[PDB]
Amino acid sequence: EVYPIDQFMNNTEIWVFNTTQPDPPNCKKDKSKSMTQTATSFVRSHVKNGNIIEENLVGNFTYFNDKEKVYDGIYISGESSGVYAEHLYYVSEDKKCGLFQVFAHVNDKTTIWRDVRVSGRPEEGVPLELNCTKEFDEYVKLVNATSKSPYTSECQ
Amino acid sequence: DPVLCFTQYEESSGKCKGLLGGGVSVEDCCLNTAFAYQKRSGGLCQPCRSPRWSLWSTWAPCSVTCSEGSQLRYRRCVGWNGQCSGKVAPGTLEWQLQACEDQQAC
Amino acid sequence: WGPWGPVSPCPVTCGLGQTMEQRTCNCAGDATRTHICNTAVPCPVDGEWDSWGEWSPCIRRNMKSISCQEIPGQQSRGRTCRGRKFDGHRCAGQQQDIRHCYSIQHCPLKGSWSEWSTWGLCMPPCGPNPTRARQRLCTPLLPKYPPTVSGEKNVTFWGRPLPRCEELQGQKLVVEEKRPCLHVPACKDPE
Ligand SMILES: *[C@@H]1O[C@@H](C)[C@@H](O)[C@@H](O[C@@H]2O[C@H](CO)[C@@H](O)[C@H](O)[C@H]2O)[C@@H]1O
Ligand SMILES: *[C@H]1O[C@H](CO)[C@@H](O)[C@H](O)[C@@H]1O
Ligand SMILES: *[C@H]1O[C@H](CO)[C@@H](O)[C@H](O)[C@@H]1O
Ligand SMILES: *[C@H]1O[C@H](CO)[C@@H](O)[C@H](O)[C@@H]1O
Ligand SMILES: *[C@H]1O[C@H](CO)[C@@H](O)[C@H](O)[C@@H]1O
Ligand SMILES: *[C@H]1O[C@H](CO)[C@@H](O)[C@H](O)[C@@H]1O
Ligand SMILES: *[C@H]1O[C@H](CO)[C@@H](O)[C@H](O)[C@@H]1O
Ligand SMILES: *[C@H]1O[C@H](CO)[C@@H](O)[C@H](O)[C@@H]1O
Ligand SMILES: *[C@H]1O[C@H](CO)[C@@H](O)[C@H](O)[C@@H]1O
Ligand SMILES: *[C@H]1O[C@H](CO)[C@@H](O)[C@H](O)[C@@H]1O
């Protein structure tokens, strides 16, 4: 099945809680500003040397699924980390946990990683749905990837 | 309309063999799926087994003096009581046309 | 000529057969006269395998998504015993076909332009001014995955990726050349 990326991203803040991106910057998050019928305009934020960097991006909705009835991905042009595509492949029952395939290409190297993203400020003593985190842990074990959390409670 | 009923069909260059005779309906002839029939005394023999495409013929020679030419090849829907691939009726041919060069194409 | 003797019992138990009668000189012409006999009973018809058809999607039990990753899943395809009738034989062999796969289904990849394919067939055959085509295709850079064994078993790439290459002559996926087929013979039906 295919969960709608246009529904998941129509929320105020989406935080990256866990990722296999090599050496990710701290406090990676997306803040929706205005979604259209075929694309969403949003602000991608992250911390570098204590400085908040903001990219104003447009993600054009597309389909990675076979039925081509529910949007589940976005193409992004000019993202500063080279991310050109994102594919939403799982959303939790409480709709607070989402699993992403991220495709990036920067100077003749195209790479892939995965994210766990939360549709709101994560909580301290409330873990995400066990199926959501378990599929990601199984991916990490099956690929011999190193996982890191970009999120901290001090993120603005 | 009575047909000619044969006991054998020859999978290669499809031809009827082992004539029983000529006063029978197709239904009775093809009660035995190993059998084959003919419309009238010397035309196309259709086997009674379910329709399926025949093997492509060998490539016919290609019309050239010395240059590049072209050549044809064919196959036929052969059988009875049904249809071959692509909702096609028994007897219908399919053709393929290939470019050809006999010599160095002088 | 004596009288025609009786017709022998039909020698087949289904479909048509040939029964003869004989005569004795008690004489020019036929001592024997054959006839077709109808049993009116249909013979058995053995079933025959259909074609395999398309592969099911590449999936791993208890993994929602494998695409674009070096994670074997597995796939199956089926075929149906068709036409078995009036007590004919059932089909022999495996009904289901199974294999291990890597999913590159809908994975956007960097591409490079392939070399030219060979010229296709002349289309339409027998039609007016038949022309043939060849194409240059945007091929994604295929990953170097190991064909090892998840037991020693094969793992096949499966799925249609979305390759990204620089545009060549105004096209992003397929560049096509046509060329007439020349000196076309005519399709004389052999009957
Ligand atoms: C007599 O009873 C019939 C029901 C059939 O089972 C006969 O066998 C059939 O004999 C013909 C040969 O004329 C074959 O074409 C069939 O394949 C075979 O099943 C049986 O002799
Ligand atoms: C024609 O095409 C190929 C041989 O060229 C085979 O699959 C088969 O002979 C078919 O009838
Ligand atoms: C036609 O094409 C070639 C002959 O050059 C062979 O593969 C075969 O004879 C086919 O029928
Ligand atoms: C055979 O043909 C008929 C019987 O059907 C008769 O004219 C005669 O018995 C002949 O021998
Ligand atoms: C036998 O066949 C017929 C008789 O019915 C005649 O042509 C002739 O008597 C021959 O001996
Ligand atoms: C199934 O297996 C292959 C197709 O991949 C062929 O030999 C044939 O189509 C068969 O039905
Ligand atoms: C599935 O596997 C490949 C496609 O990747 C083909 O051999 C065929 O389509 C089969 O059904
Ligand atoms: C397209 O494919 C590659 C670039 O992706 C190059 O070989 C060349 O630019 C070609 O036109
Ligand atoms: C196709 O055309 C010619 C050779 O046929 C070359 O320029 C090159 O191989 C291209 O792929
Ligand atoms: C197209 O033209 C020649 C002659 O037919 C072929 O041999 C070759 O495959 C090329 O692609």
Cα(C104)–Cα(B74) distance, integer angstroms: 37
Cα(B24)–Cα(B22) distance, integer angstroms: 6
Say whether both C13 and C102 belong to one domain. no
Cα(A72)–Cα(A91) distance, integer angstroms: 11
The residue assigned the tokens 């447009």 is A58
Say whether both C124 and C168 belong to one domain. yes
Cα(B32)–Cα(A88) distance, integer angstroms: 59
Cα dihedral sign, A38-A41-A42-A44: positive
Q: How many domains does chain C fold into?
A: 3
Supply the range of the domain harboring residue C36. Answer: 1-43
3-state secondary structure of B3: strand
The two structure tokens encoding residue A28:
């990676």
Torsion from C-alpha of B1, B4, B8, B14, nearest 10 degrees: -80
Ligand 5 geometric centre to CA of C7 (Å): 19
C173 part of a folded domain:
yes
Residue A102 CB burial class (10 angstroms; 0-12, 13-18, ≥19): buried
Cα(B72)–Cα(B93) distance, integer angstroms: 12
Cα(A100)–Cα(B83) distance, integer angstroms: 48
Q: Is the pair C, A in contact (3+ CB pairs within 8 Å)? A: yes
Cα(C155)–Cα(C148) distance, integer angstroms: 7
Which residue in chain A is spatially nearest to C66 when comparing CA positions? A139
Note the Cα A57 to chain centre separation in Å: 14
User: Which residues of chain A from 91 to 150 reach within 8 Å of chain C, CB to CB?
Assistant: 99, 101, 103, 105, 110, 112, 135, 138-139, 142-143
| Cβ-contact B97, C121 below 8 angstroms | yes
Say whether both C13 and C77 belong to one domain. no
Question: Resolution in angstroms, to 1 decimal, for this deposition?
Answer: 3.4
Tell me, what amino acid is at B46?
Q
Q: Write the DSSP symbol of residue A69.
A: -
Tell me, what amino acid is at C53?
G
Torsion from C-alpha of B74, B79, B84, B88, nearest 10 degrees: 80
Q: Which of A155, A16, A22 is nearest to A97 (CA)?
A: A16
Say whether both C90 and C57 belong to one domain. yes
Q: Kindly report the backbone phi and psi dihedral angles of residue A6, in degrees, each rounded to the nearest multiple of 5, phi listed first.
A: -70, -25
| Cβ-contact C157, C104 below 8 angstroms | yes
**Cα end-to-end span (Å), chain C:** 45
Mutate to test the interface with A, among C56, C64, C103, C112 (most CBs of A within 10 A): C64
Say whether both C86 and C54 belong to one domain. yes
Q: Which long-range contacts (CB under 8 A, 24 or more apart) does A46-51 make?
A: A46/A150, A47/A155
Say whether both C151 and C94 belong to one domain. yes
The two structure tokens encoding residue C60:
């791993």
Cα(B55)–Cα(B96) distance, integer angstroms: 13
**Cα end-to-end span (Å), chain B:** 56
Cα(C85)–Cα(A91) distance, integer angstroms: 50
Say whether both C71 and C101 belong to one domain. yes
Residue C30 CB burial class (10 angstroms; 0-12, 13-18, ≥19): exposed
Interface of chain C toward chain B, CB-CB under 8 angstroms? 12, 14-18, 34-36, 38-43, 45, 48, 83, 119, 121-123, 125-126, 130, 132, 181-185, 187, 189, 191
Q: Which fold has domain A5-143?
A: Lipocalin (2.40.128)
Tell me, what amino acid is at B88?
V
Q: Is beta strand C155-158 parallel, antiparallel or unpaired with respect to C96-103?
A: parallel
| Cβ-contact B77, B49 below 8 angstroms | no
C177 part of a folded domain:
yes
Residue C107's Cβ-side half-sphere holds a number of Cα atoms within 13 Å equal to: 27
| Cβ-contact A114, A20 below 8 angstroms | yes
User: Helix, strand, coil proportions of chain A in percent (round to 5)?
Assistant: 10, 45, 45
Tell me, what amino acid is at C94?
Q
Q: Which of A53, A52, A40, A51 is nearest to A9 (CA)?
A: A40
Q: For B32, which of C15, C121, C185 is closest by C-beta distance?
A: C15
The two structure tokens encoding residue C28:
């020019």
Say whether both C151 and C112 belong to one domain. no
Say whether both C38 and C73 belong to one domain. no
Say whether both C6 and C96 belong to one domain. no
The two structure tokens encoding residue A110:
């195209």
State the method.
X-ray
The two structure tokens encoding residue A95:
């709709």
- Beta strands (DSSP E) in chain C are 16-22, 32-38, 48-49, 73-78, 81-82, 96-103, 108-113, 122-123, 131-140, 155-158, 162-164, 174-180
C188 part of a folded domain:
no
Note the Cα A138 to chain centre separation in Å: 18
Sorted by where each begins, the domain ranges of chain A are: 5-143
Torsion from C-alpha of B10, B16, B18, B19, nearest 10 degrees: 170
Tell me, what amino acid is at B94?
E
Note the Cα C48 to chain centre separation in Å: 12
Say whether both C117 and C170 belong to one domain. yes
Q: Which of C181, A24, A89 is nearest to B101 (CA)?
A: C181
CB-CB under 8 Å, B24 with C16: yes
Mutate to test the interface with C, among A1, A64, A75 (most CBs of C within 10 A): A64
Say whether both C82 and C150 belong to one domain. yes
| Cβ-contact A19, A114 below 8 angstroms | yes
